Amino acid sequence: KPQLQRLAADADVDRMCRLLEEDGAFILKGLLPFDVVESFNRELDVQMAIPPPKGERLLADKFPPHFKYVPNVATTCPTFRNTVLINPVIHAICEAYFQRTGDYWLSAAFLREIESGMPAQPFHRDDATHPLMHYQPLEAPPVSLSVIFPLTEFTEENGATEVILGSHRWTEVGTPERDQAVLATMDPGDVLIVRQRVVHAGGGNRTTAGKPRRVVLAYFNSVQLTPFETYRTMPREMVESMTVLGQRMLGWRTMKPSDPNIVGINLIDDKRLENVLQLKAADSPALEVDLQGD
Amino acid sequence: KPQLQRLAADADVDRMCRLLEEDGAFILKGLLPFDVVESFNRELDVQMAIPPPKGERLLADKFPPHFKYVPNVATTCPTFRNTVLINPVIHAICEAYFQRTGDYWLSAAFLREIESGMPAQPFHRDDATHPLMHYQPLEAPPVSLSVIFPLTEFTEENGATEVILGSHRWTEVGTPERDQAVLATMDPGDVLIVRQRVVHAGGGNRTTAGKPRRVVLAYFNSVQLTPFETYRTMPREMVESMTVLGQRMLGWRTMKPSDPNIVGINLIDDKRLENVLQLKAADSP
Numbered sequence: 237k238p239q240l241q242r243l244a245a246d247a248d249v250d251r252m253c254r255l256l257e258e259d260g261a262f263i264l265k266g267l268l269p270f271d272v273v274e275s276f277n278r279e280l281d282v283q284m285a286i287p288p289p290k291g292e293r294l295l296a297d298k299f300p301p302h303f304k305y306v307p308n309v310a311t312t313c314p315t316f317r318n319t320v321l322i323n324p325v326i327h328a329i330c331e332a333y334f335q336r337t338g339d340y341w342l343s344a345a346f347l348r349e350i351e352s353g354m355p356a357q358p359f360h361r362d363d364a365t366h367p368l369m370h371y372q373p374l375e376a377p378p379v380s381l382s383v384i385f386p387l388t389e390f391t392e393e394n395g396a397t398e399v400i401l402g403s404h405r406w407t408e409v410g411t412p413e414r415d416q417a418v419l420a421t422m423d424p425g426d427v428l429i430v431r432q433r434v435v436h437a438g439g440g441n442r443t444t445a446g447k448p449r450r451v452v453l454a455y456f457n458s459v460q461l462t463p464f465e466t467y468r469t470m471p472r473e474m475v476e477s478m479t480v481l482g483q484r485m486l487g488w489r490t491m492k493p494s495d496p497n498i499v500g501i502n503l504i505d506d507k508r509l510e511n512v513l514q515l516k517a518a519d520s521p522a523l524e525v526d527l528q529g530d
Numbered sequence: 531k532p533q534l535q536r537l538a539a540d541a542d543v544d545r546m547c548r549l550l551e552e553d554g555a556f557i558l559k560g561l562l563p564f565d566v567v568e569s570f571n572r573e574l575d576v577q578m579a580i581p582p583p584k585g586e587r588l589l590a591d592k593f594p595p596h597f598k599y600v601p602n603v604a605t606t607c608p609t610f611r612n613t614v615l616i617n618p619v620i621h622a623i624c625e626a627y628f629q630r631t632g633d634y635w636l637s638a639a640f641l642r643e644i645e646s647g648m649p650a651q652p653f654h655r656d657d658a659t660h661p662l663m664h665y666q667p668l669e670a671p672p673v674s675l676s677v678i679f680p681l682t683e684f685t686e687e688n689g690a691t692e693v694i695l696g697s698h699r700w701t702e703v704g705t706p707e708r709d710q711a712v713l714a715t716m717d718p719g720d721v722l723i724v725r726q727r728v729v730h731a732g733g734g735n736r737t738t739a740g741k742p743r744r745v746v747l748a749y750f751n752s753v754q755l756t757p758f759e760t761y762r763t764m765p766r767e768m769v770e771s772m773t774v775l776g777q778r779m780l781g782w783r784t785m786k787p788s789d790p791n792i793v794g795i796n797l798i799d800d801k802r803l804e805n806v807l808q809l810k811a812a813d814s815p
């Protein structure tokens with residue numbers, strides 16, 4: 237079977253965009269160096285070690301207590317917020333992918349851990365958080381991109397993501413056979429990029445030695461789509477320590493859907509949100525050198 | 531020609547919903563009493579009295595200077611924020627209309643004032659703010675509702691909204707004639723309700739001398755769609771003074787698109803936004 241293509245970080249962006257259109261998915265090999273990955277895993281370990289709260293938890297309360305989940309990792313994991321989330325290759329791909337849609341931002345990024353002995357997910361499309369996506373025709377400009385970070389090894393045995401190449405062109409998911417899919421076997425620091433409507437499934441984890449498979453799932457959506465996670469409660473000091481791009485990803489700035497929206501979105505007082513908030517950013521001084529950068 | 535149906539404010543919501551699916555629009559007679567209209571007009575006069583600003587204006591700068599415009603009137607006009615925005619008839623309609631898509635909220639509510647001698651808009655559908663709406667099939671759950679508040683009288687001369695009934699079923703706008711439309715002639719306190727995909731046009735204002743025509747346009751959208759105006763800079767005191775319904779409309783609470791979304795949207799820390807913020811509300815201890 238034709239396999240997922242693995243591309244280095246300096247690969248051609250037009251090529252990556254065409255892989256998304258033809259295959260529906262590809263892998264960035266070794267995008268994140270091992271020390272970034274392990275610093276991220278460490279930050280994630282701290283979050284998972286927090287004791288269970290007494291209050292309501294919207295997703296977690298629907299699952300048994302062994303459910304392993306860290307929501308909105310950008311607020312508790314500085315490595316994701318300051319390094320992974322603003323990676324320039326990821327954003328080069330997003331800008332090409334979202335060219336017909338306009339601006340994009342982060343809808344969600346969260347950890348899942350899949351224990352030994354777990355079965356494989358059913359094949360599905362990622363059209364449930366924003367159900368209107370189910371009715372978008374294939375020809376419409378895409379409004380969502382799934383970006384998948386393996387934080388342990390993904391192998392055939394521990395449940396590497398199953399992707400059915402070309403399936404974004406299918407009318408319905410139906411009930412595909414597992415052998416129609418190819419495996420996104422990867423090393424931590426690789427990244428899997430999956431186009432909207434592509435049929436896929438988590439592979440579960442069929443190892444028996446008790447080693448979980450860890451994954452962070454990020455959804456970059458058209459700014460027309462409401463973020464699943466709202467980063468509005470971040471403290472100002474944390475927000476201002478981010479770059480402009482990171483503030484844009486986390487909903488703190490006015491954004492621009494494609495024409496025929498000629499104005500923008502996420503604004504107030506007919507002004508940009510960042511101006512009403514007088515928001516500073518870490519790389520403002522580099523983006524405005526001679527004071528005439530408009 | 532069939533005209534826009536005028537309904538008493540206490541008409542049956544099943545009748546309103548049927549008019550939206552057959553005609554695509556209808557008028558509510560005297561929904562807002564005179565004191566509400568007058569209170570609202572007072573508050574909008576204070577905003578109109580603000581001098582032209584010294585900086586960028588994202589919307590207004592795209593248009594000629596005879597553009598009169600007050601953005602996000604919920605943050606400056608208490609009568610809209612705590613009375614009009616939470617009108618139980620509007621919301622009865624919204625709940626019925628959005629039943630297939632789930633929760634809705636306020637994408638924008640703003641004032642426009644149309645001067646004498648202004649030409650009509652071309653016929654259009656309101657699918658420009660969220661361009662993805664252009665590609666949704668007719669049969670898909672609607673994600674947007676237009677709610678139009680005349681704040682002066684709407685007459686044939688001063689540019690009452692032109693609405694083409696049943697045109698939500700057209701595959702495209704085409705090149706329709708003005709006589710295919712009917713006029714939303716109204717008195718202050720009435721409300722015009724327009725379904726997604728309905729071809730319509732602002733009438734401009736072809737009076738020759740007279741007070742400008744004044745209208746507040748409110749867009750209620752599925753909570754799946756990012757609000758055009760963000761109300762997140764409202765003071766905590768102002769937010770907590772509102773009802774739960776008001777806070778939900780202005781984006782301060784976790785909301786719920788229809789299944790298969792089984793968790794919600796606009797949340798954080800796997801908790802409701804209002805619980806993370808410890809938000810009080812007027813009608814909620």
Ligand SMILES: O=C(O)CCC(=O)C(=O)O
Pocket residue numbers: 362382383384395396397398430436437438439451453
């Ligand atoms: O990565 C996996 O194992 C499943 C990923 C997935 O289902 C998704 O990104 O929607």
Ligand SMILES: [Cl-]
Pocket residue numbers: 470471472473
């Ligand atoms: Cl703060």
Ligand SMILES: [Co+2]
Pocket residue numbers: 360361362436
């Ligand atoms: Co999925």
Ligand SMILES: [Co+2]
Pocket residue numbers: 654655656730731732
């Ligand atoms: Co319009």
Ligand SMILES: [Fe+2]
Pocket residue numbers: 707709
């Ligand atoms: Fe004619």
